[PDB]
Amino acid sequence: VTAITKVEREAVLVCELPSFDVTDVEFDLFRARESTDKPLDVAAAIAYRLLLGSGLPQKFGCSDEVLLNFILQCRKKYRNVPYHNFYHVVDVCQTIHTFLYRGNVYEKLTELECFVLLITALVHDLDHMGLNNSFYLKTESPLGILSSASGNTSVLEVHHCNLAVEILSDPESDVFDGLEGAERTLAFRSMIDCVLATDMAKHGSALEAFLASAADQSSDEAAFHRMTMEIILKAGDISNVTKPFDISRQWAMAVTEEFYRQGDMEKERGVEVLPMFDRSKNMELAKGQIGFIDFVAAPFFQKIVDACLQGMQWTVDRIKSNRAQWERVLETR
Ligand SMILES: COc1ccc(C2=NN(C3CCN(C(=O)CN4C(=O)CC(C)(C)CC4=O)CC3)C(=O)[C@@H]3CC=CC[C@H]23)cc1OC
Ligand SMILES: [Mg+2]
Ligand SMILES: [Zn+2]
């Protein structure tokens, strides 16, 4: 791979982010992007600052410089698609920082594990092309073939891991190079396990194992740490409905357009298109958010907060509040 030039670093370093608390639950990434031309440098600056303000890279021998390289190597592998772009992963990073520090989930993890989560956020969707795992299987594309031949149906997640492990194999972007022995091994293994658990086909399985582990006082401790890491990245990944309504709406618009584009390409190839991806059906934003809330998000956040993440209660509160707000949009459309 190429190296990261010194001008690119200064482009990020210069951004001062006035009037923005990056650690706050109500931080608005959309506002931050509209605040300037070159939102890709403001995005990266947000990640930079989050990782410094945690105190964590310094403790694991990661320099202010290779941190910035790592971010920019990540950024360059994100494509210009409507949802699964660089801004999604910065959002997941920032959101995870709030669960750890405002939600007190840091209490349940080592410092290394907190550092790994913040890093993993930034790699967890590398080289996403706006198409889901199903698309690669039904069209027998090379990645689908390659994943089917090695056993794993998690087509993209294996791919994102391969690219994470590739970015980290260059020493000038290796944020885990300051680690040795069991610590170094654990950074890689936990990063990879977390990215693989982002496959929503495995959603129910991962939730149910975390909850079983949290109910049991005699659970293996290392295993409960690992499941909690996985649950927190999953939580970040489905965190759009836990934000102030206007932010939550903007995320829903971006996702919807990405799904519609997949559906148009499925039509071109004669492959089957589920109704969620079908632009012509022209379903309302609101009904789809309420369905996501009821089937996926509300149960997930309610169950993990009750089982053991008590500090994350606001997520359940804001899901409820956003749901009633979408109900009001239907009732008055
Ligand atoms: C802002 O709103 C959204 C943000 C992200 C997503 C993603 N969706 N998914 C899958 C989640 C499971 N899924 C469902 O269709 C679940 N579901 C409903 O949504 C309502 C229903 C149709 C009535 C019944 C039902 O089963 C398929 C899509 C992903 O895998 C994406 C990538 C990773 C994580 C989440 C993200 C969806 C959003 O709004 C719908
Ligand atoms: Mg993903
Ligand atoms: Zn994601």
Question: Cβ(206)–Cβ(237) under 8 Å?
Answer: no
288: Cβ below 6 Å to ligand 1? yes
Question: Cβ(105)–Cβ(232) under 8 Å?
Answer: yes
Cα angle 282, 285, 287 (rounded to 5 degrees) comes to 95
Centre of ligand 2 to C-alpha 199, Å, is 6
User: What CA–CA distance (Å, rounded) separates 159 from 167?
Assistant: 13
Nearest C-alpha to atom 12 of ligand 1 is from which residue? 200
At 283 the three-state DSSP class reads coil
Centre of ligand 1 to C-alpha 206, Å, is 16
Which of 91, 238, 259, 296 for mutating ligand 1's site (highest number of atoms within 8 Å of CB)? 296
199: Cβ below 6 Å to ligand 1? no
- Report the 10 Å Cβ neighbour count for 257: 14
* Phi, psi (rounded to 5 degrees) for 97: -55, -45
For 3-70, give the secondary structure using H, E and C.
CCCHHHHHHHHCCCCCCCCCCCCCCCHHHHHHCCCCHHHHHHHHHHHHHHHHCHHHHCCCCHHHHHHH
Token pair listed for 137: 């299987």
Buried/exposed 198-219: b ≥16 CB within 10 Å, e otherwise: bbeebeeebbebbbebbeeeee
Question: Cβ(59)–Cβ(47) under 8 Å?
Answer: no
Token pair listed for 330: 């239907």
Give the single-character DSSP code of 293: I
Question: Cβ(128)–Cβ(78) under 8 Å?
Answer: yes
Every domain of the chain and the residues it spans: 1-333
135: Cβ below 6 Å to ligand 1? no
Closest CA to 313 of 44, 108, 104, 19: 104
Residues making up the chain, counted from first to last: 333
Q: Which of 84, 128, 160, 225 is catalytic?
A: 84
Active site residue 84: yes
Token pair listed for 131: 């198409």
The amino acid present at 81, given as its one-letter code, is: V
What is the CATH number that goes with domain 1-333?
1.10.1300.10
Q: Which approach determined this entry?
A: X-ray
The string of DSSP codes covering 88-149 is HHHHHHHHHHHHHHTS-GGGGS-HHHHHHHHHHHHHTTTT--S--HHHHHHTT-HHHHHHHH
User: What CA–CA distance (Å, rounded) separates 300 from 97?
Assistant: 19
200: Cβ below 6 Å to ligand 1? yes
Intra-chain end-to-end CA distance of the chain, in Å: 51
> Counting atoms of ligand 1 from 1, which one is nearest the CA of 84?
32
> Counting atoms of ligand 1 from 1, which one is nearest the CA of 254?
1
Alpha-carbon separation of residue 66 from 98, 216, 224, 236, 290 (angstroms): 24, 40, 31, 25, 42
